[PDB]
Design a protein around this ligand. Structure first.
Ligand SMILES: Cc1cc2nc3c(=O)[nH]c(=O)nc-3n(C[C@H](O)[C@H](O)[C@H](O)COP(=O)(O)OP(=O)(O)OC[C@H]3O[C@@H](n4cnc5c(N)ncnc54)[C@H](O)[C@@H]3O)c2cc1C
Ligand SMILES: Cc1cc2nc3c(=O)[nH]c(=O)nc-3n(C[C@H](O)[C@H](O)[C@H](O)COP(=O)(O)OP(=O)(O)OC[C@H]3O[C@@H](n4cnc5c(N)ncnc54)[C@H](O)[C@@H]3O)c2cc1C
Ligand SMILES: Cc1cc2nc3c(=O)[nH]c(=O)nc-3n(C[C@H](O)[C@H](O)[C@H](O)COP(=O)(O)OP(=O)(O)OC[C@H]3O[C@@H](n4cnc5c(N)ncnc54)[C@H](O)[C@@H]3O)c2cc1C
Ligand SMILES: Cc1cc2nc3c(=O)[nH]c(=O)nc-3n(C[C@H](O)[C@H](O)[C@H](O)COP(=O)(O)OP(=O)(O)OC[C@H]3O[C@@H](n4cnc5c(N)ncnc54)[C@H](O)[C@@H]3O)c2cc1C
Ligand SMILES: Nc1nc2c(c(=O)[nH]1)N1CN(c3ccc(C(=O)N[C@@H](CCC(=O)O)C(=O)O)cc3)C[C@H]1CN2
Ligand SMILES: Nc1nc2c(c(=O)[nH]1)N1CN(c3ccc(C(=O)N[C@@H](CCC(=O)O)C(=O)O)cc3)C[C@H]1CN2
Ligand SMILES: Nc1nc2c(c(=O)[nH]1)N1CN(c3ccc(C(=O)N[C@@H](CCC(=O)O)C(=O)O)cc3)C[C@H]1CN2
Ligand SMILES: Nc1nc2c(c(=O)[nH]1)N1CN(c3ccc(C(=O)N[C@@H](CCC(=O)O)C(=O)O)cc3)C[C@H]1CN2
Ligand SMILES: Nc1nc2c(c(=O)[nH]1)N1CN(c3ccc(C(=O)N[C@@H](CCC(=O)O)C(=O)O)cc3)C[C@H]1CN2
Ligand SMILES: Nc1nc2c(c(=O)[nH]1)N1CN(c3ccc(C(=O)N[C@@H](CCC(=O)O)C(=O)O)cc3)C[C@H]1CN2
Ligand SMILES: Nc1nc2c(c(=O)[nH]1)N1CN(c3ccc(C(=O)N[C@@H](CCC(=O)O)C(=O)O)cc3)C[C@H]1CN2
Ligand SMILES: Nc1nc2c(c(=O)[nH]1)N1CN(c3ccc(C(=O)N[C@@H](CCC(=O)O)C(=O)O)cc3)C[C@H]1CN2
Ligand SMILES: O=c1ccn([C@H]2C[C@H](O)[C@@H](COP(=O)(O)O)O2)c(=O)[nH]1
Ligand SMILES: O=c1ccn([C@H]2C[C@H](O)[C@@H](COP(=O)(O)O)O2)c(=O)[nH]1
Ligand SMILES: O=c1ccn([C@H]2C[C@H](O)[C@@H](COP(=O)(O)O)O2)c(=O)[nH]1
Ligand SMILES: O=c1ccn([C@H]2C[C@H](O)[C@@H](COP(=O)(O)O)O2)c(=O)[nH]1
Ligand SMILES: [Cl-]
Ligand SMILES: [Cl-]
Ligand SMILES: [Cl-]
Ligand SMILES: [Cl-]
Lengths: 214, 214, 214, 214
């Protein structure tokens, strides 16, 4: 399975996939034939004209490890399926996204970037210590967790078809999206390209609305 | 690929599937483990309590040949993907659903059922003859086809996840649904049972709302 | 209520609407203020950049009378709500779309267009006569109706938000769509313009993908 | 507009509504009549048999102020529309949900509940102080906010139809849901009952799956 490390402790991994470029061609044609130049031209035609329903017949499942603030943005994509770790039902692990000092490149700051990174580490350590103190005193998990910060890592399974994935890439593989989710979208794109090369190349050429891919 | 004949000239065929019973278990648990009693109990637990999002991670693609009046009902299931043969873009084939005389069992009629079957065959033959006359006189396809009856066969690809498929089975594998679409739903159920035995058995035991399966 | 005649016997009527241009502005801003240049500029900004979720907070309900082949295309728009007259549960009325001879403008035909119109009327009359014969002999409605042609009129209620309506207009108020549904989309557009002038004008300027509106 | 205070600093307010009980009746019947015992019986019939599409023609818009951990759960309801305050684009206000000591009723704790409440207040104060320090040193908002806890208040507009609202009530007006979101769902229910009394009463009698309403 293709797995790609993201941020300091995150990842994207492909769990499963149904279909390939030919799945869209066969759905478009409503083919009996389960047997090229013509198939690739059909994908380009569909993409250039906005005929994207055939790409709904290609489906992916990913396992993603990401901070909560990234997952909040990601879960706004309603045309998909999600199942996520629960802070009601589980004790949550001490794992936080701590930005690199390079995260602040281009910003002039009155605290050195290495000190910003330190201050973030210090406050999330204090928050986790309070979380644990509450848990260990008998406070229910679902209440104790409310002190934890948005940079806490979470994990989820995401099942999404290629049409909705292309929408995700338009929006998230783009400079207007937050840099952290851009990094995830770059990995999603790499996996999509590997699994569906003709669809992906046609997408970049004719339909992709963002400004970071190729 | 599993294929099942339906009605006089129809079929349902499985084109592809992503996942199996374990896909729902792994999504529910957000598992790293890609490795029983415990997995089957989890599926039953989910089903008995209405926790059905994990079943969205199992996906099917079918190729279906059905009369238009069956397809009209089927396409009301919005949480799915469809691509269908077009009467704008193609010449449509002379293939009609002609009910068997047994279709009228339990109804007292003042025309013998064999004569009902004959009258249906006769009018659809006349309609197709008019369609062809129009086509052959230069009338555009998209206009000529408007004379064709609702028992004309059509074909489509359908991609659907197991949660939405279970909704389809609740509604269509049921005595209140039209008998013709019941027959399709029985075939969809057979394929679902073969591919996802634990999910299907748990569905019948705990969640299925209809009155025809088992 | 705004009502517009379409084709020979069809219509589109607005039944209800929630909101107006300001609904999108207030949702975008998450406003407490329930109180111009600034509001119109926000709508244009949203539209020009593809930020269309705020328009989901404007909702319409229409009552539409259209032939079945138009309704088949229309009902492919899944992000909406429909309720339609049933040929299982009701006797269907003798009302058919008969194209005008002008429908064939630009096509050279070997049957005069007035004779095409006559041949269509003649076959649908024969089909309805068979339908009625079957009904009156005790054949269940749901079976008798299968002989009826795709130009039979049907009626439905459609509830749709402005984002999905704009998608509908991109696709259906366009020369590539069948002329008959174009005529419906023109009426939908007129009603949308009346109810949401700033959104509609911004849509035409920045986002509309079709080639018939203004 | 109906507004209801929730938790310590939260609220639910109705912003707009389209339709009423009669909207579902008129959609079900595909009525021309825009004019009782019969209308209420139709709603009960629909509800008792699971025929819930007609209720999609009743739509609500709410403005909700809730902590992020409540909003995370709420936003899992995909069949709806949301627009939320952004921590990328805005400075976020110092407003946190601090549980009442009574929140821990039924739990034996080794820290007195008043001290739990104090410890939660203390850590979120420290987190906000770090957030502000980062902002005021020139760290971009979208990065500074990652230290803020899940009990931070957020606000959003929610547009939802009555069918999806009933699903929300089944799931969230229920003892298995987290107590905090139960409190929101109780307020949503009160507003739904006021606006759609026949639908709500039929829902409670025939369809509601939860264990807290009436
Ligand atoms: C840079 C950026 C900044 C953002 N800022 C904010 C913000 O400040 N606040 C905020 O709340 N959100 C914000 N968002 C989130 C944004 O509003 C969308 O929720 C998100 O981008 C998902 O887009 P989508 O609706 O196209 O995706 P999906 O929800 O996956 O929908 C896919 C497609 O299905 C259709 N669709 C799905 N459901 C409906 C429906 N109910 N009605 C109509 N059409 C539907 C649309 O065609 C849509 O494109 C931001 C997103 C980005 C990328
Ligand atoms: C016996 C029978 C008779 C019928 N008679 C008629 C009739 O006379 N007229 C008629 O028009 N239709 C009729 N229908 C069709 C019926 O109204 C539904 O369109 C169909 O059964 C599909 O059901 P669904 O909406 O659950 O499926 P899908 O559209 O696949 O939706 C699946 C689920 O997603 C949710 N959902 C999807 N979209 C929305 C949305 N926009 N809002 C809220 N929830 C949503 C719901 O939880 C729904 O159960 C009939 C169906 C049956 C089975
Ligand atoms: C000129 C023309 C010719 C056509 N020819 C054919 C044909 O030959 N055969 C045929 O079968 N169909 C045909 N169609 C129908 C077409 O494939 C679409 O079904 C229809 O245009 C509705 O578009 P939509 O999916 O954008 O709308 P909706 O279904 O309303 O969806 C709205 C938006 O929500 C999103 N969306 C909704 N559901 C999903 C999902 N499951 N996955 C991903 N994204 C989703 C997409 O962003 C979509 O744009 C044709 C349409 C047109 C206009
Ligand atoms: C007590 C409780 C505990 C929970 N625990 C967890 C947890 O540990 N982890 C977790 O990730 N989530 C958890 N959830 C969230 C839960 O999985 C659902 O996301 C949430 O309840 C919304 O339900 P829904 O999908 O029915 O709603 P919506 O998303 O609004 O969907 C409404 C209806 O539309 C249909 N539907 C919509 N989209 C699809 C689709 N893509 N495929 C098929 N059908 C569709 C279904 O019929 C559905 O009922 C929990 C929820 C509750 C109430
Ligand atoms: N908006 C819109 N969406 C669409 C289409 C469309 O025309 N418009 N259609 C393009 N279609 C095909 C199918 C087969 C071939 C081919 O065999 N050559 C070419 C195109 C199928 C369908 C898919 N979705
Ligand atoms: N992206 C980025 N990187 C940087 C800086 C910057 O402004 N932006 N600069 C911040 N600078 C200092 C030095 C001393 C103090 C102080 O003592 N208080 C504060 C800041 C040094 C320098 C380090 N690298
Ligand atoms: N309405 C609703 N929907 C839900 C759930 C829920 O509680 N309510 N949840 C049940 N969940 C799991 C996950 C793992 C195990 C297990 O490991 N034992 C058990 C249950 C996941 C999630 C899926 N959807
Ligand atoms: N389901 C079903 N099957 C049937 C019948 C029926 O009523 N229902 N009956 C209809 N019956 C006749 C006989 C003669 C004429 C006539 O000459 N006019 C008309 C009907 C015969 C019988 C045949 N089988
Ligand atoms: N893809 C995408 N979708 C979006 C947005 C976005 O940035 N990208 N956002 C634009 N947003 C607003 C809200 C208020 C104002 C204003 O007050 N000036 C301006 C913009 C809200 C949100 C809506 N949807
Ligand atoms: N759009 C359109 N309009 C038309 C025609 C046409 O080709 N296209 N033409 C078809 N023409 C005739 C005349 C006689 C016969 C015949 O007797 N067989 C058949 C066709 C006449 C003319 C009438 N108007
Ligand atoms: N699953 C399912 N969904 C449905 C229906 C159905 O039968 N099954 N139908 C019930 N329908 C009506 C319409 C009018 C009346 C009446 O006038 N008496 C009664 C029922 C409309 C439609 C709505 N959705
Ligand atoms: N819901 C709930 N309410 C409670 C308690 C409880 O267990 N659950 N109890 C906790 N109790 C104390 C007293 C002293 C210390 C200590 O000094 N360490 C710690 C706990 C007192 C009492 C207060 N009210
Ligand atoms: O780039 C963005 C900005 C916002 N949001 C959505 C996610 C949350 O529901 C809400 C606020 O997100 P933040 O701006 O706080 O990340 O809007 C996104 O999806 N992407
Ligand atoms: O059993 C039914 C009856 C109706 N419909 C939907 C399909 C059409 O959109 C409309 C009318 O269908 P008929 O009753 O004419 O089949 O309602 C169904 O989906 N299933
Ligand atoms: O312009 C078109 C052509 C096709 N279809 C969809 C509707 C039917 O599900 C199927 C076949 O439609 P016809 O081409 O037969 O109209 O594809 C459309 O929605 N619009
Ligand atoms: O009662 C619950 C529990 C979980 N979730 C969803 C929301 C988040 O996406 C994820 C984790 O939620 P918490 O258990 O951490 O609240 O699962 C709910 O929607 N409701
Ligand atoms: Cl840990
Ligand atoms: Cl043929
Ligand atoms: Cl009549
Ligand atoms: Cl403040």
């Amino acid at each position: 399975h293709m797995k790609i490390d993201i941020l300091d402790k995150g990842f994207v991994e492909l769990v499963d996939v149904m279909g390939n470029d030919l799945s869209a061609v066969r759905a478009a044609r409503v083919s009996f034939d389960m047997g090229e130049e013509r198939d690739r031209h059909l994908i380009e035609y569909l993409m250039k004209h906005g005929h994207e329903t055939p790409f709904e017949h290609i489906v992916f499942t990913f396992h993603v490890k990401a901070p909560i603030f990234v997952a909040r943005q990601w879960f706004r994509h309603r045309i998909a399926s999600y199942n996520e770790l629960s802070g009601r039902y589980s004790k949550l692990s001490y794992e936080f996204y701590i930005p690199s000092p390079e995260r602040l490149e281009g910003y002039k700051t009155t605290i050195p970037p290495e000190r910003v990174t330190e201050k973030i580490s210090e406050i999330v350590d204090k928050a986790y210590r309070t979380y644990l103190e509450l848990i260990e005193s008998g406070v229910p998990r679902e209440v104790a967790r409310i002190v934890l910060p948005l940079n806490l890592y979470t994990r989820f399974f995401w099942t999404v078809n290629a049409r909705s994935l292309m929408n995700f890439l338009n929006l998230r593989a783009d400079s207007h999206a937050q840099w952290e989710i851009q990094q995830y979208a770059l990995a999603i794109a790499r996996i999509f390209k590997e699994k569906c090369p003709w669809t992906f190349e046609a997408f970049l050429k004719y339909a992709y609305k963002g400004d970071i891919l190729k």
